[PDB]
């Protein structure tokens with residue numbers, strides 16, 4: 001299954017993607033994750049991406065499309081994949097079409113995780129992420145057993161650099177304007193699937209599984 | 217962990233820095249210490265810098281940027297570094313941008329230790345420093361157990377020459393006018409973080425340490 005996860009900042013793409021890959025085995029490919037890994041490793045890509053990411057702006061299309069094209073060519077994508085946070089603009093979506101046509105892996109469906117913008121600031125400010133595995137928690141909505149540490153590996157939890165108030169605000173502004181054009185693009189193709197993400201994590205996933213179970 | 221510590225004269229950069237270097241082991245790079253070490257060995261850099269430091273004025277940008285660029289290229293900065301007192305002019309900040317881009321070590325955070333200017337004269341005129349290790353004490357706020365000597369190594373404590381009323385006032389003057397442009401510069405970059413430095417030393421450090429999880 002060839003899938004795309006889309007949604008506004010903090011809608012729950014990572015949270016749902018974690019459950020998806022466990023059950024279906026396709027690689028979870030998050031451009032955000034890839035950019036942060038690059039920044040952590042201090043590579044040229046990371047340095048270029050940093051200036052945009054830190055302010056909450058989108059990283060330019062060319063490099064972003066470029067790292068995705070490279071990543072999707074890996075052997076672990078032979079049986080499917082789960083893109084997360086890409087495409088996030090119409091131009092990226094049209095570029096992906098070409099890339100997938102060449103790799104012979106056209107998209108099956110695009111899952112849009114719908115969540116009221118007015119509730120995203122809270123999901124992000126309350127977010128705590130594992131410094132070891134990258135899994136996310138929320139001080140109120142999905143807290144760890146032991147505060148400050150990951151349930152899975154005992155790793156230290158921290159706050160993402162771009163989860164501060166001003167940056168979160170910018171990320172919402174920037175992505176909201178890219179949102180309807182992208183939904184229209186995939187709606188026109190007919191494979192956009194909207195899922196209400198303002199529910200218990202397990203209920204959101206239950207809907208996702210009802211779709212994915214028909215794609216094996 | 218690439219960090220910059222900024223704050224008005226006496227706000228507590230050295231104090232917090234010492235804590236950071238112990239918990240994380242990244243080099244503590246203080247331009248003031250560098251210039252004073254030079255003044256002691258009486259190198260030509262030291263003699264040039266002296267005129268400015270004794271008057272409380274800023275050493276010129278060119279020579280200052282030069283010694284920092286060389287310092288940051290050392291092998292001990294491989295895992296990160298703690299800049300202290302640099303940059304302190306927009307020109308220095310822009311130069312640092314280039315230097316770090318060339319070294320591929322971009323700044324993670326610029327930590328501004330905020331302390332009201334009205335209490336700094338007292339912090340500096342009451343400061344006593346160990347002639348052996350350089351750690352600082354305060355006659356009222358953080359006194360040595362035995363007056364005049366360092367708790368750690370027994371070394372004699374002294375009062376830095378520039379911690380006199382006249383020079384302190386000039387230092388506050390000179391640095392206050394450079395402060396807002398620096399804050400704006402880094403607020404623009406997206407990684408400026410303000411910390412209330414008018415609390416007990418460990419309370420201030422707790423907030424600093426909170427920002428440090430998740431940095432490699």
Ligand SMILES: Nc1ncnc2c1ncn2[C@@H]1O[C@H](COP(=O)(O)OP(=O)(O)OP(=O)(O)OP(=O)(O)OP(=O)(O)OC[C@H]2O[C@@H](n3cnc4c(N)ncnc43)[C@H](O)[C@@H]2O)[C@@H](O)[C@H]1O
Nearest residue numbers: 009010011012013014015031032053057058059085127137
């Ligand atoms: N294609 C692209 N083009 C250009 N630039 C790009 C790009 N892709 C990335 N970038 C760049 O990368 C940066 C950010 O990218 P990215 O990491 O992709 O940012 P994002 O889209 O804003 O998404 P988030 O990771 O912040 O959230 P998420 O939806 O995964 O939510 P999560 O599951 O963590 O959940 C959030 C919180 O909510 C909680 N939560 C999850 N589900 C629920 C639920 N059902 N109920 C209650 N709480 C929940 C979680 O525990 C957590 O604390 C930007 O600077 C940008 O420039």
Ligand SMILES: Nc1ncnc2c1ncn2[C@@H]1O[C@H](COP(=O)(O)OP(=O)(O)OP(=O)(O)OP(=O)(O)OP(=O)(O)OC[C@H]2O[C@@H](n3cnc4c(N)ncnc43)[C@H](O)[C@@H]2O)[C@@H](O)[C@H]1O
Nearest residue numbers: 225226227228229230231247248269273275301343353354
């Ligand atoms: N980039 C650059 N460009 C051009 N010129 C440059 C330059 N960099 C340096 N220079 C030149 O060098 C000169 C000196 O530079 P520099 O040495 O960097 O001077 P500074 O910026 O004035 O800072 P200080 O060292 O005096 O104070 P601090 O913030 O470290 O405080 P500390 O922790 O000791 O604390 C102070 C006191 O407060 C006490 N204290 C600390 N924390 C607390 C607390 N939380 N509560 C109560 N007391 C506390 C301490 O015990 C202590 O006694 C400049 O004037 C300039 O001429």
Ligand SMILES: [Mg+2]
Nearest residue numbers: 013014030032
């Ligand atoms: Mg995510």
Ligand SMILES: [Mg+2]
Nearest residue numbers: 229230246248
């Ligand atoms: Mg100092």
Ligand SMILES: [Zn+2]
Nearest residue numbers: 130132133150
């Ligand atoms: Zn973990």
Ligand SMILES: [Zn+2]
Nearest residue numbers: 346349366369
């Ligand atoms: Zn000492």
